[PDB]
Amino acid sequence: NGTVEEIVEAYLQVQASADGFDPSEQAAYEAFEAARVRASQELAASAE
């Protein structure tokens, strides 16, 4: 039920990132990788 801003906020830690936004593509890669790992653990939780 959220909006786009809430989605990017929650699953990629925008505020928890290093102060001063890194516009590097590596930063986006690491953020999306972390989101993937979190979703992967949640998937096993739902499986159980």
Partner 1 sequence: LRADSIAKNLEAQKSDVLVRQLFLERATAQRDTLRVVEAIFSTSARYV
Residue 48 C-beta: closest distance to partner 1, Å: 43
Type of residue found at 39:
A
Work out whether 18 is an interface residue with partner 1 (CB under 8 A). no
Residues that bind partner 1 (rule: CB under 8 A) add up to a total of 3
Q: Which residues contact 21 (CB under 8 A, 6 or more apart)?
A: 14, 27
Type of residue found at 22:
D
Work out whether 21 is an interface residue with partner 1 (CB under 8 A). yes
Q: How many residues does the chain have?
A: 48
Work out whether 20 is an interface residue with partner 1 (CB under 8 A). yes
* Tokens encoding 45: 């939780």
Site residues (vs partner 1, CB under 8 A): 20-21, 23
